[PDB]
Amino acid sequence: TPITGKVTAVIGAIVDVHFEQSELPAILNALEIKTPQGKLVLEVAQHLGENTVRTIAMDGTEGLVRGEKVLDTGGPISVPVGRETLGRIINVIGEPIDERGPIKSKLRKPIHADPPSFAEQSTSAEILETGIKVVDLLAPYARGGKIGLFGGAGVGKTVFIQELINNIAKAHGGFSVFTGVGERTREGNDLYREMKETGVINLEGESKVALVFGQMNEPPGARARVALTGLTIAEYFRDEEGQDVLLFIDNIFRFTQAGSEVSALLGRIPSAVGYQPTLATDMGLLQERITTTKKGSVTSVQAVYVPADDLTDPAPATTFAHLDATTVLSRGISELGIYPAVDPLDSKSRLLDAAVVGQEHYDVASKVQETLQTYKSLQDIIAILGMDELSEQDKLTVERARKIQRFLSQPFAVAEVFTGIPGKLVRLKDTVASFKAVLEGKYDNIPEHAFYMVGGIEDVVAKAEKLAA
Amino acid sequence: STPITGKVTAVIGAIVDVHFEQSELPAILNALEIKTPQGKLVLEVAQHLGENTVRTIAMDGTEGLVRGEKVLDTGGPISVPVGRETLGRIINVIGEPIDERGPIKSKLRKPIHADPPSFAEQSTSAEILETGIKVVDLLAPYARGGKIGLFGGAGVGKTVFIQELINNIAKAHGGFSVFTGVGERTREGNDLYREMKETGVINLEGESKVALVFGQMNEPPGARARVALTGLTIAEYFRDEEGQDVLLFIDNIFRFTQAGSEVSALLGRIPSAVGYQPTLATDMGLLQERITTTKKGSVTSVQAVYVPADDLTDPAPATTFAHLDATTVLSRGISELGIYPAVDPLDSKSRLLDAAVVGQEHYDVASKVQETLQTYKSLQDIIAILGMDELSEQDKLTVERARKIQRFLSQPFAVAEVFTGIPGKLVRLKDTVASFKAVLEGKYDNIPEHAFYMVGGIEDVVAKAEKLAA
Amino acid sequence: EVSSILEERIKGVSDEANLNETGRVLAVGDGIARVFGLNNIQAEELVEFSSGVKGMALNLEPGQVGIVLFGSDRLVKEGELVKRTGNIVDVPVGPGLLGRVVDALGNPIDGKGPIDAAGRSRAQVKAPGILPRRSVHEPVQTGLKAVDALVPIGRGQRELIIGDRQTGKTAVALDTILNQKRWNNGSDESKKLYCVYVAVGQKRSTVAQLVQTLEQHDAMKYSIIVAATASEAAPLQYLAPFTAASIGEWFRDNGKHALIVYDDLSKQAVAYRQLSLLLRRPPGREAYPGDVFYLHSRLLERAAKLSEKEGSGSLTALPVIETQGGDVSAYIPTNVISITDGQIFLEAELFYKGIRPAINVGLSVSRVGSAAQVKALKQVAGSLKLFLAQYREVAAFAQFGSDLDASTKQTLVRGERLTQLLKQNQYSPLATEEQVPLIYAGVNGHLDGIELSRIGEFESSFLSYLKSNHNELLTEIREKGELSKELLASLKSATESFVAT
Amino acid sequence: TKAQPTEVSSILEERIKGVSDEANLNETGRVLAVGDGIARVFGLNNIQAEELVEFSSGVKGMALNLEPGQVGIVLFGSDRLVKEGELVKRTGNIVDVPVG
Amino acid sequence: LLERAAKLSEKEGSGSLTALPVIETQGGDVSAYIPTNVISITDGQIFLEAELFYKGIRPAINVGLSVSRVGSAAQVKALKQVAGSLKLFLAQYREVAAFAQ
Amino acid sequence: PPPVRLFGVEGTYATALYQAAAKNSSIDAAFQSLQKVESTVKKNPKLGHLLLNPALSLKDRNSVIDAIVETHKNLDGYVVNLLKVLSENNRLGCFEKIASDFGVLNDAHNGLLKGTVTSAEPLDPKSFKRIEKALSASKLVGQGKSLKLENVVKPEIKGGLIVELGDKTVDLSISTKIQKLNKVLED
Amino acid sequence: VRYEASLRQLEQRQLAKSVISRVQSELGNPKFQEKVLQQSISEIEQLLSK
């Protein structure tokens, strides 16, 4: 628009501008303030009345002189999408961070999207395997699924996610997006390295991945819109090409978190627990722009960082409504020498049923939950007394439950070095057989260290010999 | 002060601000009436904000309000009707019936802001109520002139309890009762209306022995609040001018509390600890203080209270614990075991438990009952952990006397011919003291536990023995 | 084709009349705005923004009137004029909402064409009187043997389903709706339910699975699905219970019964929090509004049974409150408990224990007692309540490793069998005729001769036994709905002939 | 812009017309606005801390807060007859009780 | 602040700025808003314990709550080979001595 | 008294100033003398527009008022007392605001309204005169509320006009009709 | 089937851009003067209907 103005204020990353022309502005516009940083791109989020707009600031706020000229772009920022975004890493505004220079496109689209309707909905009930024993039996995923992960980071989240990439994107091979919201820069480089080595990113060709990286160094505003940027790319894939995609995020708590910082400033009074009053509306849009449509479907794996490792907080809690399946991970179990650290009693899926992933799957999975739970209820008793001061029927359950517990592990193929055990991969079909077996009492009569750091039933047997000698 | 015309300036839900013309405003606590396409909207004036701007609490449903819509001033407070002819009749916040009896038959009208009676007028309570409910009579005696309190949590049979007391005592006495419902459901109101017309207590020919004030939760938080005030004023007319003792009831009194908390926040006031009003103390006091024994007549409330999650570290129930003379707890557990009433009598304390009020004999029997039961409750952990160890013949005999007593607390009720189908029994004060005395002495330690199940007096235990024999 | 649709629309558009109000937008963004002016504005009335947005108006001030936008805020600009529609918010009600999804405002989002309108109604109607109400006697079941058996489910009552998020909170409701097939088919409409399911704060994909479930089991033909997904505006999530209640109320007026599911009120509350703080007016406890109680209580007292000078209808309510990492003493949870007349508490731990559908019988209460269980079903569950309440004390003592007498272990042995009988498979309808036989067996001590693992094997087989031989016993129960002398004997003999397996 | 108790209409119209304090807005007072039983009285610039003041409604008050403009009184009796524009005489004796 | 710490490339001399930020917990509880904010950004803990400190190791390391999970690409072959799975082994001894008593 | 309160921000002053002049029986003069003085403060060479935000003393401000009342000796004694009130409260950033507010109160007492009939580009002089005739025939101008038609030019009017007065608008602009036509054909 | 449903959408945005293309020609012309005048005389009839 030829609307010009000057900068009244510059309070943190939430600059306010005041338009000297009576031509009136619109919500979700963008303004460029000419900076010695080249230029700074900002986004109107509020109009406060009297032509004093309030704008979110993506990049730095060192250099912004007060009463400095603007020109109003007149609309939302459009990123660049295509198949010429594959093998490039793009910043929020579009810029290469891997420096293969300007990003090519056929279509450049607004960041924001309008979430699909009830009419555009389609359904799924497919079976997707990671190949992880605990995930498959107790919480099976599907094709187009939305998955949720929880508990803190710097404890194996990165590795866990890296491993999910290592399985699902090579059992698919089509288009994929990695979008990293408030990514830890030293790790981000390990993904870049890891991918090129494992043949994913290929830059003497075109990759089977496209990428978005936003670091946690960056002002709150940029961190909020890393995610929306990423989604524009995934929608391109979903819609224009007509093909199903992947999405991985480590962590999406950051979307929430960054929005919480900017809220206080914007005019908004923040709710109790210091979380923005707008969590609901932002969540609602994101989780419905990753959704199973008539065209494609974006099967997504989401990592939430939880503060104090409490779900009682409203930010993690409001997310559960929009997730078909969860696999809650708790730091303590990671400490115990068990990987994956996913809790087996604090896991759920809406696709674990007696005809969805079959009846055998359900009976095995049911039994493990019943066995472990009873054991959980008796943990007080077992420690204050002994383990023959228990009633007899229970003695069988307790002993059975202990074997399952050591069994749950499955060394990772991406952290094979760090565990100090080779990476193990086993089928959903191999896993159903292996859990079945333990429950039958077939190889129940052998040490608890035998089931300790090993994948399926087969590995257990091989190790009894190792201890025996 | 006097009738004037003001125009609405701001509608913020229940909260309504008016901007009356210069030098002309109503005084605090008045009633403004505003023409609305839904009855007559009554606004209660609660502040002055300067330049002749008042801020009000709604008494009738808000919807379709224009800023600029004329507001008259009555010149005085919300004025209800009172009388010995409003007995059976139903009255709400604006004194209209909701079972469509049209305009109330009024002898007199009165304000709901009645300042409390003073210390000169006081008299010392010596008249003794009987409820005819054994567990209540023996372990927390009520006295007529009292301020009884039916503490309990959620869904614990409070309504069923109130229903038995009103069915029995109101007819018995030559006094009045006014039954007041603060913010309670239209399922309950319709049950409370139906059951008490049937029994002959409320009757359309003749003068009803218990009046009704139904204030219900579909109405505003403001409108719900001053329902309690409405009932009280009827009891006050009875106390004073008619010169008759009252046997008051209010139901549930946490609804009263909750409403004031809500409106504290809307008026802009700063909330206190655990989301409670800063004005919590004084509001309970105002109502409780009006309900008192004067040389005019008594007023005796029996008040249901909702106690979130059987929790009393929560400040709103704990403050209320002070005001109420002869507490009882309706524990959730007692009801489920099949024991009616739901009263747990080792958590009920009364201040009306002396030893020359109720005689020495009453106090002493109940004391033994308290100990006998509590030693048995103490031994439960002991069997739980140790097994059959660390016991004695003395313990065995106490365990046995207590289980005979434990199943000797159940008294069927007529107003639970709808819950279990077991019809009522009435047990005199002197009669309960005797029958409990007999068991303690161990003359009825030869009659099985289930032969004290759903009995009254002593005759009843002997008769329930024959049934089990036969 | 496409040329014709667009040309009709141009004909269908434009040409506005002389306006009688105005006001100029100033503050604006978040789905929320504030205008300067407006002296004819009513509270709750609809104001038409010249961008294509409509926003209802909830706060008026002699400064700046707060009209909360519905529409996308990106369309809205400042300095625009707004025009009062001049009507408070209303929805068309009619029998053309049968087997179709409609949103917040009452237009179809499932693309099944225009609805059939026989009236309009308003979202606020409020509770009927004491005289036009009668008491609830009206049997109804949920297709969960446990729930029916332990707590008295009625038609015209309000029962609050409470417990942790995503424990098949929705799934519990879906079993009831499936089981509401049985009465709908029956000829009489004085039985029929036209169930209305309200879904607030849920993703579009959750709703889309649920409609497939309903049609597959051939239960979508009386059901209505009202929606307000989590992206869609803070007013529209607030308006979703109130307009569901007006749809429900039309059946009531006609003298037909229906049932309203409010899943979840907890997320309605969260919306209203966002709304109240962006009209910058004080909230109550924990940031949730001060007038949040007014919302749940008014709504809830409208699902009411009617007397015989009226339709003799009754809308039934089931609230659902998901407690975020538990907490029953949290402000929205506490308020609703007080308003409801019963609780059907769902406990998370028991789910892993294998007691699905999960319930905890102490946390579930009935203040006024049984009065809406089928009379047959009352007779059999007579001591079921006393056993299970006792089993819980005895079991806790029993597993310690201490010594027990035979008397205490009759409770343990008896309880274990009873609990195992309760277990049922989700999405499986059930009938009175097939819950009366099973409770008899359990109470009258014929499930102790049968081993604990094969109690489940036994159930399916016992009812089959009856189809071939004692098919007369089942018919008497369906037809008379009570057990007399003869029926007790007949059944006592029916249990005996097949106790094996 | 900002809120002061000299931007009240009664205060402003009297100053513009050249009316002074005159020991009525300096010692005595006049109520500006009373709500929540917290009367705020305009005048009393000569007053001691928490001093007893007597209203024309019969109600007596204390001065926990002495702020620049107003003196924020807290009322000890009921609000029922308390209203705007009252003269609030300065008793000139701090709160006291008989001893003996 | 923390992500300014960086092992850089050979275009940049291959430089370092190793971060080692030291957090003081309240009462030996590792889940609170400040500990957890620092934990997400970093990898591993060098969790330290007061009981072990009194007991002759000044300063003391708790290895059941200490990992380094990007630590073994910084190490030399000697201290890889000699130390291989020794990290597991003293967490096998943890399992044993829990139920030994 | 106020001739109904208008303006919350700085209309509290405008209200006082007006109610005090109603008892004098000259509001019009007051307004006129204040208006001419309001302009001559603004058009002061250095420190007209350039000192409106106080950063001095209340006493230095009081002397800013004192020097202003030398600029004209006709200003009336009540607007002289208004200055004192403003100098003491130390407000001069919304000084012209009170003056305009006072004009709106004042000219409502006169029975004049100041309307605008915003358009895409200037309309004809016969169009103007036809609109003032038309408004007078209607009840939108009741008399005592008589617009003075001020054409303003707005680039966001793509044809057509919007007519404005009080809180009453008649909108037959093209910008609204095209915005609505477009939306349905992309709905 | 998928291409037909895209083709219906593509028809709807393509004929949308012709409406805009036609609007630019009207806002070019001295119809931009002449039709503003039509509005103007219509507003006289509107205020007369009050």
mmCIF file with all atom_site columns, N, CA, C and O in Angstrom, chain C residues 126-154:
data_model
loop_
_atom_site.group_PDB
_atom_site.id
_atom_site.type_symbol
_atom_site.label_atom_id
_atom_site.label_alt_id
_atom_site.label_comp_id
_atom_site.label_asym_id
_atom_site.label_entity_id
_atom_site.label_seq_id
_atom_site.pdbx_PDB_ins_code
_atom_site.Cartn_x
_atom_site.Cartn_y
_atom_site.Cartn_z
_atom_site.occupancy
_atom_site.B_iso_or_equiv
_atom_site.pdbx_formal_charge
_atom_site.auth_seq_id
_atom_site.auth_comp_id
_atom_site.auth_asym_id
_atom_site.auth_atom_id
_atom_site.pdbx_PDB_model_num
ATOM 1   N N  . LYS C 1 126 ? -34.456 -20.361 28.412 1.00 0.00 ? 126 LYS C N  1
ATOM 2   C CA . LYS C 1 126 ? -34.494 -20.570 29.846 1.00 0.00 ? 126 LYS C CA 1
ATOM 3   C C  . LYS C 1 126 ? -35.597 -21.549 30.312 1.00 0.00 ? 126 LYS C C  1
ATOM 4   O O  . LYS C 1 126 ? -36.389 -22.051 29.499 1.00 0.00 ? 126 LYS C O  1
ATOM 5   N N  . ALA C 1 127 ? -35.442 -21.958 31.608 1.00 0.00 ? 127 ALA C N  1
ATOM 6   C CA . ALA C 1 127 ? -36.089 -23.089 32.274 1.00 0.00 ? 127 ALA C CA 1
ATOM 7   C C  . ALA C 1 127 ? -37.581 -22.968 32.349 1.00 0.00 ? 127 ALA C C  1
ATOM 8   O O  . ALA C 1 127 ? -38.055 -21.837 32.229 1.00 0.00 ? 127 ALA C O  1
ATOM 9   N N  . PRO C 1 128 ? -38.387 -23.944 32.415 1.00 0.00 ? 128 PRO C N  1
ATOM 10  C CA . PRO C 1 128 ? -39.830 -23.742 32.463 1.00 0.00 ? 128 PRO C CA 1
ATOM 11  C C  . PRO C 1 128 ? -40.133 -23.698 33.930 1.00 0.00 ? 128 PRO C C  1
ATOM 12  O O  . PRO C 1 128 ? -39.250 -23.867 34.749 1.00 0.00 ? 128 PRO C O  1
ATOM 13  N N  . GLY C 1 129 ? -41.430 -23.468 34.252 1.00 0.00 ? 129 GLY C N  1
ATOM 14  C CA . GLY C 1 129 ? -41.841 -23.212 35.605 1.00 0.00 ? 129 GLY C CA 1
ATOM 15  C C  . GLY C 1 129 ? -41.914 -24.484 36.297 1.00 0.00 ? 129 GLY C C  1
ATOM 16  O O  . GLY C 1 129 ? -41.697 -25.597 35.775 1.00 0.00 ? 129 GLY C O  1
ATOM 17  N N  . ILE C 1 130 ? -42.157 -24.309 37.592 1.00 0.00 ? 130 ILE C N  1
ATOM 18  C CA . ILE C 1 130 ? -42.454 -25.342 38.612 1.00 0.00 ? 130 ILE C CA 1
ATOM 19  C C  . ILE C 1 130 ? -43.793 -26.076 38.277 1.00 0.00 ? 130 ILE C C  1
ATOM 20  O O  . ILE C 1 130 ? -43.820 -27.291 38.220 1.00 0.00 ? 130 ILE C O  1
ATOM 21  N N  . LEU C 1 131 ? -44.947 -25.295 38.003 1.00 0.00 ? 131 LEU C N  1
ATOM 22  C CA . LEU C 1 131 ? -46.209 -25.845 37.537 1.00 0.00 ? 131 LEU C CA 1
ATOM 23  C C  . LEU C 1 131 ? -46.006 -26.506 36.103 1.00 0.00 ? 131 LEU C C  1
ATOM 24  O O  . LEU C 1 131 ? -46.434 -27.653 36.021 1.00 0.00 ? 131 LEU C O  1
ATOM 25  N N  . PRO C 1 132 ? -45.392 -26.020 35.062 1.00 0.00 ? 132 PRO C N  1
ATOM 26  C CA . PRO C 1 132 ? -45.277 -26.813 33.831 1.00 0.00 ? 132 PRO C CA 1
ATOM 27  C C  . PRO C 1 132 ? -44.196 -27.913 33.793 1.00 0.00 ? 132 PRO C C  1
ATOM 28  O O  . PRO C 1 132 ? -43.785 -28.298 32.712 1.00 0.00 ? 132 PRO C O  1
ATOM 29  N N  . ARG C 1 133 ? -43.796 -28.474 34.959 1.00 0.00 ? 133 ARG C N  1
ATOM 30  C CA . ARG C 1 133 ? -42.802 -29.475 35.156 1.00 0.00 ? 133 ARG C CA 1
ATOM 31  C C  . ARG C 1 133 ? -43.457 -30.557 35.901 1.00 0.00 ? 133 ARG C C  1
ATOM 32  O O  . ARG C 1 133 ? -44.366 -30.314 36.631 1.00 0.00 ? 133 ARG C O  1
ATOM 33  N N  . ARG C 1 134 ? -42.988 -31.789 35.599 1.00 0.00 ? 134 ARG C N  1
ATOM 34  C CA . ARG C 1 134 ? -43.472 -32.933 36.338 1.00 0.00 ? 134 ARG C CA 1
ATOM 35  C C  . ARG C 1 134 ? -42.138 -33.666 36.541 1.00 0.00 ? 134 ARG C C  1
ATOM 36  O O  . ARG C 1 134 ? -41.092 -33.339 36.006 1.00 0.00 ? 134 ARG C O  1
ATOM 37  N N  . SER C 1 135 ? -42.222 -34.743 37.433 1.00 0.00 ? 135 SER C N  1
ATOM 38  C CA . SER C 1 135 ? -41.146 -35.561 37.956 1.00 0.00 ? 135 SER C CA 1
ATOM 39  C C  . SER C 1 135 ? -40.813 -36.689 36.992 1.00 0.00 ? 135 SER C C  1
ATOM 40  O O  . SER C 1 135 ? -41.606 -37.042 36.126 1.00 0.00 ? 135 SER C O  1
ATOM 41  N N  . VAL C 1 136 ? -39.586 -37.249 37.169 1.00 0.00 ? 136 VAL C N  1
ATOM 42  C CA . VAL C 1 136 ? -38.955 -38.077 36.150 1.00 0.00 ? 136 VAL C CA 1
ATOM 43  C C  . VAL C 1 136 ? -38.982 -39.426 36.701 1.00 0.00 ? 136 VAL C C  1
ATOM 44  O O  . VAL C 1 136 ? -38.540 -39.708 37.760 1.00 0.00 ? 136 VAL C O  1
ATOM 45  N N  . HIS C 1 137 ? -39.490 -40.352 35.821 1.00 0.00 ? 137 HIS C N  1
ATOM 46  C CA . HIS C 1 137 ? -39.840 -41.715 36.144 1.00 0.00 ? 137 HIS C CA 1
ATOM 47  C C  . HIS C 1 137 ? -39.439 -42.645 35.081 1.00 0.00 ? 137 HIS C C  1
ATOM 48  O O  . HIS C 1 137 ? -39.583 -43.862 35.218 1.00 0.00 ? 137 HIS C O  1
ATOM 49  N N  . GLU C 1 138 ? -38.953 -41.976 34.041 1.00 0.00 ? 138 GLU C N  1
ATOM 50  C CA . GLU C 1 138 ? -38.749 -42.343 32.653 1.00 0.00 ? 138 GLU C CA 1
ATOM 51  C C  . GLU C 1 138 ? -37.506 -43.160 32.471 1.00 0.00 ? 138 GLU C C  1
ATOM 52  O O  . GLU C 1 138 ? -36.416 -42.615 32.559 1.00 0.00 ? 138 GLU C O  1
ATOM 53  N N  . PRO C 1 139 ? -37.658 -44.553 32.303 1.00 0.00 ? 139 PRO C N  1
ATOM 54  C CA . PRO C 1 139 ? -36.474 -45.401 32.187 1.00 0.00 ? 139 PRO C CA 1
ATOM 55  C C  . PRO C 1 139 ? -35.650 -45.118 30.946 1.00 0.00 ? 139 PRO C C  1
ATOM 56  O O  . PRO C 1 139 ? -36.177 -44.842 29.875 1.00 0.00 ? 139 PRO C O  1
ATOM 57  N N  . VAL C 1 140 ? -34.358 -45.323 31.089 1.00 0.00 ? 140 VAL C N  1
ATOM 58  C CA . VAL C 1 140 ? -33.502 -45.193 29.928 1.00 0.00 ? 140 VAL C CA 1
ATOM 59  C C  . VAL C 1 140 ? -32.196 -45.854 30.329 1.00 0.00 ? 140 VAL C C  1
ATOM 60  O O  . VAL C 1 140 ? -31.931 -45.797 31.554 1.00 0.00 ? 140 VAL C O  1
ATOM 61  N N  . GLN C 1 141 ? -31.417 -46.384 29.316 1.00 0.00 ? 141 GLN C N  1
ATOM 62  C CA . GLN C 1 141 ? -30.201 -47.112 29.613 1.00 0.00 ? 141 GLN C CA 1
ATOM 63  C C  . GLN C 1 141 ? -29.188 -46.548 28.670 1.00 0.00 ? 141 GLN C C  1
ATOM 64  O O  . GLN C 1 141 ? -29.468 -45.737 27.789 1.00 0.00 ? 141 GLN C O  1
ATOM 65  N N  . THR C 1 142 ? -27.899 -46.890 28.831 1.00 0.00 ? 142 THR C N  1
ATOM 66  C CA . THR C 1 142 ? -26.721 -46.341 28.185 1.00 0.00 ? 142 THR C CA 1
ATOM 67  C C  . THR C 1 142 ? -25.983 -47.461 27.455 1.00 0.00 ? 142 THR C C  1
ATOM 68  O O  . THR C 1 142 ? -24.974 -47.213 26.776 1.00 0.00 ? 142 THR C O  1
ATOM 69  N N  . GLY C 1 143 ? -26.485 -48.746 27.550 1.00 0.00 ? 143 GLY C N  1
ATOM 70  C CA . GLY C 1 143 ? -25.825 -49.882 26.932 1.00 0.00 ? 143 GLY C CA 1
ATOM 71  C C  . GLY C 1 143 ? -24.595 -50.256 27.612 1.00 0.00 ? 143 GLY C C  1
ATOM 72  O O  . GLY C 1 143 ? -23.863 -51.034 27.034 1.00 0.00 ? 143 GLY C O  1
ATOM 73  N N  . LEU C 1 144 ? -24.330 -49.810 28.875 1.00 0.00 ? 144 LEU C N  1
ATOM 74  C CA . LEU C 1 144 ? -23.288 -50.218 29.761 1.00 0.00 ? 144 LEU C CA 1
ATOM 75  C C  . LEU C 1 144 ? -24.081 -50.750 30.939 1.00 0.00 ? 144 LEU C C  1
ATOM 76  O O  . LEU C 1 144 ? -24.827 -50.047 31.587 1.00 0.00 ? 144 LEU C O  1
ATOM 77  N N  . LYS C 1 145 ? -23.849 -52.008 31.216 1.00 0.00 ? 145 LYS C N  1
ATOM 78  C CA . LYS C 1 145 ? -24.510 -52.729 32.251 1.00 0.00 ? 145 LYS C CA 1
ATOM 79  C C  . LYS C 1 145 ? -24.143 -52.175 33.618 1.00 0.00 ? 145 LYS C C  1
ATOM 80  O O  . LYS C 1 145 ? -24.964 -51.927 34.482 1.00 0.00 ? 145 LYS C O  1
ATOM 81  N N  . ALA C 1 146 ? -22.816 -51.781 33.842 1.00 0.00 ? 146 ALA C N  1
ATOM 82  C CA . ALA C 1 146 ? -22.389 -51.197 34.994 1.00 0.00 ? 146 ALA C CA 1
ATOM 83  C C  . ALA C 1 146 ? -23.015 -49.929 35.425 1.00 0.00 ? 146 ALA C C  1
ATOM 84  O O  . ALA C 1 146 ? -23.299 -49.790 36.627 1.00 0.00 ? 146 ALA C O  1
ATOM 85  N N  . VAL C 1 147 ? -23.127 -48.965 34.537 1.00 0.00 ? 147 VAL C N  1
ATOM 86  C CA . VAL C 1 147 ? -23.633 -47.681 34.833 1.00 0.00 ? 147 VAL C CA 1
ATOM 87  C C  . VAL C 1 147 ? -25.083 -47.696 35.255 1.00 0.00 ? 147 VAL C C  1
ATOM 88  O O  . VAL C 1 147 ? -25.481 -47.082 36.228 1.00 0.00 ? 147 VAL C O  1
ATOM 89  N N  . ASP C 1 148 ? -25.917 -48.545 34.529 1.00 0.00 ? 148 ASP C N  1
ATOM 90  C CA . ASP C 1 148 ? -27.326 -48.658 34.711 1.00 0.00 ? 148 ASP C CA 1
ATOM 91  C C  . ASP C 1 148 ? -27.763 -49.146 35.963 1.00 0.00 ? 148 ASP C C  1
ATOM 92  O O  . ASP C 1 148 ? -28.790 -48.627 36.473 1.00 0.00 ? 148 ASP C O  1
ATOM 93  N N  . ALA C 1 149 ? -27.034 -50.211 36.370 1.00 0.00 ? 149 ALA C N  1
ATOM 94  C CA . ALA C 1 149 ? -27.013 -51.081 37.508 1.00 0.00 ? 149 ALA C CA 1
ATOM 95  C C  . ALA C 1 149 ? -26.703 -50.274 38.768 1.00 0.00 ? 149 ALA C C  1
ATOM 96  O O  . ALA C 1 149 ? -27.429 -50.360 39.806 1.00 0.00 ? 149 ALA C O  1
ATOM 97  N N  . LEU C 1 150 ? -25.657 -49.434 38.772 1.00 0.00 ? 150 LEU C N  1
ATOM 98  C CA . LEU C 1 150 ? -25.225 -48.698 39.964 1.00 0.00 ? 150 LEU C CA 1
ATOM 99  C C  . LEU C 1 150 ? -25.826 -47.387 40.142 1.00 0.00 ? 150 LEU C C  1
ATOM 100 O O  . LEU C 1 150 ? -26.084 -47.058 41.270 1.00 0.00 ? 150 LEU C O  1
ATOM 101 N N  . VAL C 1 151 ? -26.145 -46.577 39.106 1.00 0.00 ? 151 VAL C N  1
ATOM 102 C CA . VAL C 1 151 ? -26.705 -45.287 39.251 1.00 0.00 ? 151 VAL C CA 1
ATOM 103 C C  . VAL C 1 151 ? -27.944 -44.999 38.453 1.00 0.00 ? 151 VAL C C  1
ATOM 104 O O  . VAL C 1 151 ? -27.971 -45.570 37.338 1.00 0.00 ? 151 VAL C O  1
ATOM 105 N N  . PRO C 1 152 ? -28.962 -44.196 38.843 1.00 0.00 ? 152 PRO C N  1
ATOM 106 C CA . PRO C 1 152 ? -30.330 -44.221 38.255 1.00 0.00 ? 152 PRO C CA 1
ATOM 107 C C  . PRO C 1 152 ? -30.370 -43.245 37.158 1.00 0.00 ? 152 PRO C C  1
ATOM 108 O O  . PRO C 1 152 ? -30.682 -42.074 37.379 1.00 0.00 ? 152 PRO C O  1
ATOM 109 N N  . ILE C 1 153 ? -30.145 -43.678 35.917 1.00 0.00 ? 153 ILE C N  1
ATOM 110 C CA . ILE C 1 153 ? -30.179 -42.806 34.695 1.00 0.00 ? 153 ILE C CA 1
ATOM 111 C C  . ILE C 1 153 ? -31.633 -42.601 34.275 1.00 0.00 ? 153 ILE C C  1
ATOM 112 O O  . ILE C 1 153 ? -32.338 -43.584 34.111 1.00 0.00 ? 153 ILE C O  1
ATOM 113 N N  . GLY C 1 154 ? -32.047 -41.295 34.057 1.00 0.00 ? 154 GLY C N  1
ATOM 114 C CA . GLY C 1 154 ? -33.387 -40.928 33.735 1.00 0.00 ? 154 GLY C CA 1
ATOM 115 C C  . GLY C 1 154 ? -33.478 -40.126 32.500 1.00 0.00 ? 154 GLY C C  1
ATOM 116 O O  . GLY C 1 154 ? -32.466 -39.753 31.938 1.00 0.00 ? 154 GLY C O  1
#
